[PDB]
Design a protein around this ligand. Structure first.
Ligand SMILES: Nc1ncnc2c1ncn2[C@@H]1O[C@H](COP(=O)(O)OP(=O)(O)NP(=O)(O)O)[C@@H](O)[C@H]1O
Ligand SMILES: Nc1ncnc2c1ncn2[C@@H]1O[C@H](COP(=O)(O)OP(=O)(O)OP(=O)(O)O)[C@@H](O)[C@H]1O
Ligand SMILES: Nc1ncnc2c1ncn2[C@@H]1O[C@H](COP(=O)(O)OP(=O)(O)O)[C@@H](O)[C@H]1O
Ligand SMILES: [Mg+2]
Ligand SMILES: [Mg+2]
Ligand SMILES: [Mg+2]
Lengths: 1194, 249, 400
């Protein structure tokens, strides 16, 4: 407290002097203790007990004196009860730096997000909203003349209320002219709307309408003619026509929101006036009394008693609280009933309890009623993130300032919090009931309640609302103090109709009656998905987007006509314009990216059912389409338009682009191997080539590192701050050391999403676009930065994170097997296998690589191989049918298409490398295409069997071999009773049994059963060949099988057989974490700062380090089902590197491999590996050797 | 049900597929639990905690909470539940046979007992969309007209669908006209649900809106039916006496 | 089957009001069955034929086994005198559980009044209430005094602590602790197990409900000017009864059991007071046309009673009841509170214009209430009965 702000010492000089004296004594004592830290030595210090007791007494006195000072400051300015002790100390302590107070005005006030100071920052000219709307004080508050924070802040609040009252008086005086008129000039009306604040505009129009109807009903009674009421309705309709004409035009966002609020108001006013139908002729009839009426009395000296809002019996006063630009609600009959019930409860001094299913507008209706009365409503979310310790302070604040308090879902609280908050609500509500007691002296009414163990005065204007969700009921103590209301079915049709009318749609009613049942259909006919949201909020967002689409079409037509010689008329353009097509376009553009492959046909079927004959045509994007095609050609990817191959992938990348345009945070939640990474990389490169803005991506696996290593941490002992990986990246971009802003920065995460590492990201993904650090820094998200999540699923993701982010679902149908086959063939025909660093950058340096067709003999050999493989890699090619059969077969691991396909491609690469080594060993006789063909066809069959049935048992390997034999024409071995997988393809096209390659070794007398002797058998040599194949391409080969089969010994023997190979055994267990791999890298490797970047390479040059991880399955999953070390290995094998937790820099691996062994995942203690990890690993089922192999070995 | 390209296009097929999906899951679950109970009572299976509590509930007649994955009347015993389950699964088998062999269009001509279905409101939604798709009509311009036909297997129009098992509480439907009855409940023979184009005709005073509750507990509302008032009967009498329609009794 | 077809009086017996008292002999046996055998055979016959009468027949079976006067004590009013004085030990709390909305503290208040024993009544729920409770418990245990602890269902943990305190405590011979509750699952099992339990339920019926209503509403409150005020209360009282009794016949009466209770009655009384005071403005008499009928009907249908109602058909029923009762026609001499009652003769609203006249009319109501009073069909009772009958059997299965 006394070393955080210098002004705290000035506020409390006696206490500062006292603490300085104590601190001196305490530091001397602690030095004495540090000299002799033994507990017996400390206990033997002379008079230590008495000194510590005296220090405890004095320190308690200062802490109390400080608490009393804080309580006095809170009592002087009751709104300070809404900020904590640290925030309050910041507010009073930072008196000179007024600009530090602007971050707390949102907690204290309703719509006041900041205050506008003078040039010298000594005079508060006015207040400002979060949107930007400002209210200039009639008489500005002078901080210099009132230096105390409480004094000038109270003057700011009082001048807020007085200004609002005076501006409302002026606005009402102006709008009475429009009310008493038959033709409102659009320009004058828009000028009036621009002049006054949104809440004052809506309130003035409400006051004018209430005054007119009141006068009319009296006139109707005497005259006997309904003419006055008809005139009121006419005027409302004329003003509504003017508002519609204005809202079709192009308006500023603030004026647009004001127009929408005014339209929502006037629709309700016209409805009420039409309800002329019931033939009311008296102003005291309940058909008029039940309506909320506004009686403005400008002559009243007290601003809080100038405007009266009366509904039925109840009669409140406008609190004149600046609400900023709030979201007005469509005044449906359900909301009318809510207003009536809550006002009746408030007049009866009872609280309100709207109950119903979530999303029915309960807390929104409570907040809207509070804002209609000019009150400050605080909504307390009763989820797990509930401030229990602050509840008493906030309750005292509500009682003292006369603010409203709404609980989002009071039944979500746990039993202890529920009971305590119920007791507090009960005492406050009993105090409120005390105000309806006539015996209590009205002249002097100090009604108080027992809050925070003190008598807190309760203002009559405050109220408590308890929104509940049945399935349950109010606590037994609050049942008799609260009036319940069933808000169970919002009138979505009228909400949609009024919002569509406010967006300029002429056929608002038809479109509403279409779009509400359609959203019901989608919510009940689309696959149960967590990211699906067809509620009222989503419907409102869709309607707003449809209005935006309508206005952009209008602007496009207007610009086209301006370019031509044709005249321009906004209303004419709006009339000759399809509203249904715009609504369907908005619905599709909002929902299709989130849809799984099965739900798109369903969505379009339900759509056609509701909208018959209306077709959705996707926007044409020829420039980006051609850039995408060029990038896909460059990256060997497959491109297609519409129904062509790659069409779904291209439409997915276009959807991802539109989501990047709309949102700043977004997710790709397709399954593994569905084209997410290629989609966003190709989009980044296409945008780079199209817009000319450089694109940089920061793939940050959030689970390979801890939360502290991701967001940074500060030492509590020394207050030393460390930047985490994400914070370091964000700060780098914000620093703009190398003009980072001038470049498109995408922060991709590429890891599982859980409600632990995204909590700090919630404010970044929200509209705030701000990262709050435990240090206290507030890092603003730059406009170019795009936070991107590439995930497999959303099983362990919060609805908050899903809602804050755009959604693009990459169903596995997006990526076709033909597309992967084409990619493999193009890469084989283009990229030479033998060439490493050379001819790798030459691919980028050459746009078409003219004159480099015969780059190497390797390239020619693999091009000839691709030619022979081409026929088999067709839509109905042997590979496809075999892959379908592979899916039919059961496997030791969860089968994925890309695991098998990658294993097959690596085996084919090894086949062409074998052709190359044969050519090198026989310069005189190159392998003629004749033999090459036979060999490649046979090796293709071999690779298909060993890649699709590698996980399968011997029976299923035989089944796949028989299926291949049935469905192929290549010459398979003619063995009567020997499996095809028992044969090797030699260099020549002929097969050769594996048993021929098995030698007959002899073991010495000792070491007879040594743990390093491996007797060569058919399984041993076969698996060793597979290891050599898949380790030539440095894949994370995994052998799985029952215990005792020989996985560990075969792996170790084969790895040690390789000369340039350092084998490191890393036994995994449930306690295994990535720090084990980091320790292994520290022990066996070194980091070198190459010009490209940090490279982690083995200390021994010219040798590849293999990390034999003996039990891949064992590492335990989190409570969200994720093995952190497995994710680390996946990152290091996919992205080829990781991130140092000390430097926050990318470290690229060099000459480092991974090999794993497992027991079947069905065994106890073994967890199934993630599909994003299994995609890269080739898994082989090492079954028991069998009678012949056992016979040979033993 | 065997999903094909044309089958998935039919809303009724999709509904029936979801129904039989849920039915099969519960069928095997309940059958496995009963088989375990038989094994324990035969003496060859040890009473685990779940087995012990299941046996206790079956002996006491309390409906097991693991069972009843669909909407069931509250407080109902195990016997009533297994009887209803047998009837529902028999209906699902019959529907399965019609869909598999009778063809997709037969699903339009088959009479469906709303009580047997787990989600009959989804059936009513499907029927509405079917009519809309066949007649190229927009979905929201369709309103439901109910015609109770005492003639067995009464002709079904293109937009008229047959529903059996409907129970009328406290009223007797004669010539598609309701008359207050002192009987406990009158079974409606063959209710015909016809999806007609919505008109601007003003609802007559002799028209009553009756809720079609899922079961006798009146806890789940499926839809509403507009019926004609016979003789000089006030609709307020129908409101006070609690006249309604039950999918199952 | 053969006996059913051959019998000629079987049809009239099946359509009889009380078939359990005249069950025909429809079973075949070698030797005449003992009276309990005939009782069980009749019970089976009633369960098969007329399940609604099963309960009545079940009582007959109990009588033919445990005597005709086995249950006769229960219909008699509870005599807490002897039970509390002897049957209850000083260290055994007397738990007095009422249905939600009912009160049972008045019983022991009158018990202590007639027993001339000092009793201290304490309302539980607040910390000051807890301190008053435990200090009064200590004073009474050391002085042999009676303690009342009202609404102790509000503090379950404090109830557990009280049970633990009473277990070790050794009270005086005249100490008596009463704890009143509204039957909640929150009540500790150990407290219920270690204390005498008394369950109180209100006497069902429109007459009893209206008598409870008139008693609760202050006489002076119903006597305030204008003189029409009393009549309004009467209608309101009637309305309250008509709905609360109708709650017994759910789901036919109300689609679900709403918590229509004292809070709604107080809110409706307050609404009537406010609006009638606004309309009258001090006049001693106002015309029945001047009463804000629309205001009362709307506030009771959407705010007072309609707040709990979430079904649209229940709301429709509530609106129909309010539109039928609260009109100017209710101030006529021939207004019919309930029509087609029992199929013949209909309830007429009392002609009087004073509170005492309305209470007299309530007290002279015939003790022959049927669901036709509530607007329900007269067979609704039968449905209720048969449900209860099935329920009994279900409970009898759970005691197996
Ligand atoms: N080809 C072989 N030559 C020699 N011994 C073999 C051979 N195959 C299996 N064995 C024996 O079988 C056992 C295999 O041990 P090991 O290689 O540790 O099995 P594993 O597959 O790692 N089983 P686990 O780690 O328990 O899941 C040893 O006792 C070996 O001696
Ligand atoms: N447009 C394309 N044309 C051809 N092949 C493609 C295309 N997109 C992707 N592929 C192939 O499919 C593979 C998987 O694609 P990608 O790496 O984008 O998957 P992902 O969705 O990010 O999966 P994971 O969850 O494993 O990270 C690519 O490595 C490539 O071989
Ligand atoms: N009368 C109305 N006009 C416009 N929108 C409404 C109306 N009623 C409800 N909504 C919308 O319905 C949603 C319900 O959200 P909210 O009220 O916060 O949750 P709950 O309904 O569970 O309390 C809100 O997003 C709100 O925009
Ligand atoms: Mg909500
Ligand atoms: Mg990826
Ligand atoms: Mg091993």
């Amino acid at each position: 407290i006394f070393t955080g702000s210098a002004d705290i010492k000035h506020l409390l000089p006696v206490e500062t002097q006292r603490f300085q004296s104590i601190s001196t004594e305490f530091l001397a004592l602690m030095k004495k203790v540090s000299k002799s830290p033994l507990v017996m030595d400390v206990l033997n210090i002379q008079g230590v007990q008495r000194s510590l007791e005296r220090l405890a007494d004095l320190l308690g006195k200062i802490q109390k004196a400080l608490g009393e000072y804080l309580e006095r400051e809170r009592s002087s300015f009751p709104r300070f009860y809404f900020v904590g002790d640290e925030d309050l100390l910041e507010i009073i302590g930072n008196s000179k730096n007024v600009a530090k107070l602007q971050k707390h005005f949102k907690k204290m006030f309703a719509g006041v997000s900041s205050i506008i100071l003078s040039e010298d920052n000594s005079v508060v000219l006015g207040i400002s909203s979060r949107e930007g709307e400002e209210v200039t004080f009639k008489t500005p508050v002078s901080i210099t003349e009132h230096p105390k924070i409480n004094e000038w802040l109270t003057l700011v609040e009082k001048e807020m209320r007085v200004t609002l009252a005076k501006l409302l008086a002026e606005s009402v005086t102006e709008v009475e002219i429009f009310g008493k008129a038959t033709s409102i000039d659009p320009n004058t009306y828009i000028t009036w709307i621009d002049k006054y604040q949104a809440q004052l505009v809506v309130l003035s129009a409400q006051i004018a309408w209430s005054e007119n109807v009141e006068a009319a009903l009296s006139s109707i009674g005497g005259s006997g003619d309904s003419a006055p009421l008809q005139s009121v309705l006419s005027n409302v309709e004329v003003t509504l026509n003017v508002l519609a004409d204005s809202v079709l035009m192009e308006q500023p966002p603030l004026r647009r929101r004001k127009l929408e609020h005014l339209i929502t108001e006037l629709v309700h006013q016209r409805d009420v006036t039409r309800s002329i139908k019931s033939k009311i002729d008296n102003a005291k009839s309940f058909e008029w009394l039940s309506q909320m009426r506004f009686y403005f009395d400008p002559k009243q000296t007290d601003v809080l008693q100038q405007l009266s809002i009366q509904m039925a019996n109840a009669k409140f006063n406008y609190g004149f609280e600046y609400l900023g630009v709030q979201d007005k609600l469509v005044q449906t009959p359900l909301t009318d009933r809510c207003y009536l019930t809550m006002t009746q409860a408030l007049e009866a001094r009872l609280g309100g309890s709207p109950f119903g299913p979530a999303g029915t507008g309960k807390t929104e209706s409570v907040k809207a009623l509070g804002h209609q009365l000019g009150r400050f409503v605080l909504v307390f979310n009763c989820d797990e993130t509930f401030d229990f310790q602050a509840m008493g302070r906030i309750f005292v604040g509500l009682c003292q300032v006369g603010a409203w308090g709404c609980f989002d879902e009071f039944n979500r609280l746990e039993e202890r919090m529920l009971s305590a908050v119920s007791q507090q609500v009960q005492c406050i509500q009993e105090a409120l009931r005390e105000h309806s007691s006539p015996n209590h002296d009205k002249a002097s009414a100090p009604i108080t309640c027992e809050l925070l163990n003190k008598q807190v005065k309760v203002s009559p204007d405050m109220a408590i609302f308890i929104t509940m969700n049945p399935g349950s009921n109010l606590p037994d103590n609050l049942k008799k103090l609260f009036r319940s209301l069933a808000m169970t079915k919002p009138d979505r049709q009228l909400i949609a109709q009024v919002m569509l009318y406010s967006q300029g749609f002429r056929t608002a009613e038809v479109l509403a009656n279409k779009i509400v049942p359609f959203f019901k259909l989608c919510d009940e006919q689309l696959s149960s998905q967590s990211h699906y949201d067809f509620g009222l909020r989503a419907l409102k967002s869709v309607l707003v987007s449809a209005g935006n689409v309508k206005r952009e079409r209008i602007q496009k037509i207007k610009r086209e006509k301006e370019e031509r010689g044709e005249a321009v008329d906004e209303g004419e353009i709006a009339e000759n314009l399809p509203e249904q097509e715009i609504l369907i376009q908005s619905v599709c553009e909002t929902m299709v990216p989130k849809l799984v492959a099965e739900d798109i046909p369903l969505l379009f079927s339900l759509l056609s059912d509701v909208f018959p004959g209306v077709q959705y045509h996707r926007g044409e994007m020829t420039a980006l389409r051609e850039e995408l095609k060029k990038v896909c050609q460059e990256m060997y990817l497959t491109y297609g338009d519409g129904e062509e191959v790659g069409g779904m992938w291209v439409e997915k990348v276009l959807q991802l682009y539109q989501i990047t345009q709309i949102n700043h945070g977004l997710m790709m939640v397709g399954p593994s191997g569905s084209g997410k990474s290629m989609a966003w990389r190709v989009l980044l490169k296409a945008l780079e080539r199209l817009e000319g803005v450089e694109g940089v991506a920061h793939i940050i696996d959030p689970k390979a590192i801890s939360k502290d290593h991701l967001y940074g941490t500060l030492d509590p002992n020394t207050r030393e701050w460390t930047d985490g990986l994400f914070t370091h990246v964000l700060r780098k971009i914000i620093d703009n050391v190398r003009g980072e802003l001038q470049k498109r920065q995408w922060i991709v995460f590429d890891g599982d999403v859980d409600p632990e590492w995204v909590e700090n990201l919630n404010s970044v993904l929200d509209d705030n676009k701000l990262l709050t650090l435990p240090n206290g820094e507030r890092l603003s998200l730059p406009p170019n930065v795009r936070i991107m999540f590439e995930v497999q699923d959303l099983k362990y993701a919060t609805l908050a994170t899903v809602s804050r982010c755009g959604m693009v679902w990459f169903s596995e149908d997006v990526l076709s097997t033909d597309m992967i086959f084409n990619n493999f063939l193009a890469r084989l025909r283009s990229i030479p296998l033998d060439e490493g660093e050379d001819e790798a950058q030459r691919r980028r340096k050459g746009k078409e690589d003219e004159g480099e067709e015969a780059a190497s003999p390797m390239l020619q050999i693999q091009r000839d191989a691709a030619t022979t493989l081409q026929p088999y890699f067709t839509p109905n090619g042997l590979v496809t049918k075999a892959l379908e059969h592979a899916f039919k077969l059961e496997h030791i691991m969860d089968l994925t298409r890309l695991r098998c396909l990658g294993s097959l491609f690596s085996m084919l690469h090894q086949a062409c490398r074998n052709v190359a080594q044969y050519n090198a060993n026989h310069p005189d006789f190159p392998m003629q295409m004749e033999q090459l063909e036979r060999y490649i066809q046979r090796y293709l069959v071999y690779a298909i069997l060993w890649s699709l049935s590698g996980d399968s048992r011997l029976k299923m390997r035989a089944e796949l071999g028989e299926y291949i034999r049935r469905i192929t024409t290549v010459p398979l071995p003619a063995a009567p009773n020997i499996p095809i997988i028992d044969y090797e393809v030699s260099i020549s096209g002929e097969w050769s049994p594996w048993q021929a390659k098995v030698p007959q070794i002899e073991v010495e007398t000792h070491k007879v059963a040594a743990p390093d002797v491996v007797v060569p058998t058919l399984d041993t040599v076969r698996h060793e060949a597979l290891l050599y194949t898949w380790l030539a391409e440095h894949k994370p080969l995994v052998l799985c099988g029952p215990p005792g089969s020989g996985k560990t010994m075969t792996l170790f023997s084969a790895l040690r057989a390789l000369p340039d190979m350092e084998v490191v055994g890393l036994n995994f267990s449930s306690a295994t974490t990535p720090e084990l791999l980091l320790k292994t890298f520290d022990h066996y490797c070194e980091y070198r700062r190459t010009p490209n970047g940090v490279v982690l390479a083995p200390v021994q040059l010219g040798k590849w380090l293999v990390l034999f991880c003996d039990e891949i399955n064992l590492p335990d999953m989190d409570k969200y089902g994720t093995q952190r070390v497995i994710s680390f290995i996946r990152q290091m094998v996919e992205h080829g590197g990781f991130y140092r937790t000390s430097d926050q820099t990318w470290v690229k691996l060099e000459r480092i491999q991974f090999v794993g062994a497992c027991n079947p995942p069905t065994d106890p203690g073994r967890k199934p590996l993630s599909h994003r990890f299994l995609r890269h690993v080739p898994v082989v089922y090492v079954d028991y050797p069998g009678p012949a192999s056992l016979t040979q070995i033993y | 049900l065997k999903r094909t390209v044309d089958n998935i296009k039919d809303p009724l097929f999709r509904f029936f597929e979801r129904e039989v999906k849920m039915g099969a899951r519960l069928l095997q679950d309940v059958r496995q639990d009963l088989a375990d109970v038989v094994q324990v009572c035969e003496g060859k299976k040890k009473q685990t905690n779940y087995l012990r509590t299941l046996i206790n509930e079956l002996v006491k007649g309390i409906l097991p909470r693991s069972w009843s994955h669909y909407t069931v009347p509250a407080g109902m015993t195990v016997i009533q539940w297994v009887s209803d389950f047998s009837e529902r699964i028999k209906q699902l088998q019959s529907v399965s046979q019609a869909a598999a062999s009778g063809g997709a269009k037969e699903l339009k001509n088959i009479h469906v007992c709303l009580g047997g279905l787990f989600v009959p409101e989804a059936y009513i939604t499907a029927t509405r969309q079917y009519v809309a798709q066949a007649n190229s009509w927009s979905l929201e311009e369709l309103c439901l007209e109910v015609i109770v036909t005492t003639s067995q297997s009464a002709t079904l129009d293109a937009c008229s669908f047959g529903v059996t098992g409907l129970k009328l509480q406290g009223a007797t439907c004669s010539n598609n006209k309701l008359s207050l009855s002192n009987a406990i409940s009158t079974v409606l023979p063959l209710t015909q649900l016809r999806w007609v184009k919505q008109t601007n005709a003003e609802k007559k005073a002799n028209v009553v809106t009756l809720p079609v509750y899922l079961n006798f507990t009146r806890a789940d509302l499926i839809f509403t039916v507009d019926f004609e008032i016979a003789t000089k009967e006030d609709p307020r009498s129908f409101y006070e006496r609690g006249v309604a329609v039950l999918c199952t009794e | 089957i053969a006996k059913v077809q051959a019998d000629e009086q079987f049809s009239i017996w099946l359509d009889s009001s009380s078939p359990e008292q005249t069950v025909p002999h429809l079973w075949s046996e070698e030797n005449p069955a003992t009276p309990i055998g005939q009782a069980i055979h009749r019970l089976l016959l009633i369960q098969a034929f007329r399940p609604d009468r099963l309960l009545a027949m079940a009582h007959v079976f109990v009588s033919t086994n445990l005597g005709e006067s086995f249950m006769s004590i229960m219909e008699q009013p509870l005599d807490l005198t002897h039970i509390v004085d002897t049957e209850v030990k000083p260290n055994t709390p007397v738990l007095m559980c009422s249905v939600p909305g009912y009160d049972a503290s008045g019983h022991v208040e009158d018990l202590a009044a007639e027993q001339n024993t000092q009793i201290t009544s304490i309302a539980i729920g607040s910390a000051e209430g807890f301190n008053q409770a435990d200090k009064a418990i200590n004073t009474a245990v050391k002085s042999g005094r009676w303690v009342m602890l009202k609404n102790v269902h509000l503090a379950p943990g404090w109830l557990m602590q009280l049970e633990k305190k009473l277990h070790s405590l050794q009270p005086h011979a005249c100490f008596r602790l009463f704890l009143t509750m509204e039957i909640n699952p929150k009540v500790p099992v150990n407290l219920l197990r270690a204390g005498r339990i008394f369950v109180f339920e209100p006497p069902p019926g429109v007459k009893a409900n209206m008598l409870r209503t008139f008693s609760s509403v202050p006489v002076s409150r119903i006597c305030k000017s204008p003189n029409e005020r009393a009549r309004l209360y009467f209608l309101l009282a009637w309305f309250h009864a008509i709905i609360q009794e109708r709650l017994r016949y759910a789901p036919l009466g109300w689609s679900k059991k709403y918590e229509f209770g004292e809070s709604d009655l107080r809110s409706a009384c307050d609404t009537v007071d406010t609006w009638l005071d606004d309309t009258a403005k001090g006049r001693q008499n106002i015309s029945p046309d001047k009463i804000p009928w629309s205001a009362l009907k709307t506030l009771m249908a959407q705010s007072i009673y309609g707040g709990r109602v979430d079904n649209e058909f229940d709301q429709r029923l509530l609106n129909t009841f309010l539109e039928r009762l609260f009109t100017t026609r209710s101030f006529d001499s021939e207004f019919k509170l309930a029509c087609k009652v029992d199929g013949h003769k209909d309830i007429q609203m009392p002609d009087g214009i004073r509170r005492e006249e309305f209470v007299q009319w309530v007290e002279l109501l015939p003790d022959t209430q049927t669901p036709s009073w509530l607007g329900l069909p007269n067979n609704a009772e039968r449905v209720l009965l048969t449900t209860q009958g099935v329920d009994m059997i279900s409970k009898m299965l759970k005691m197996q």
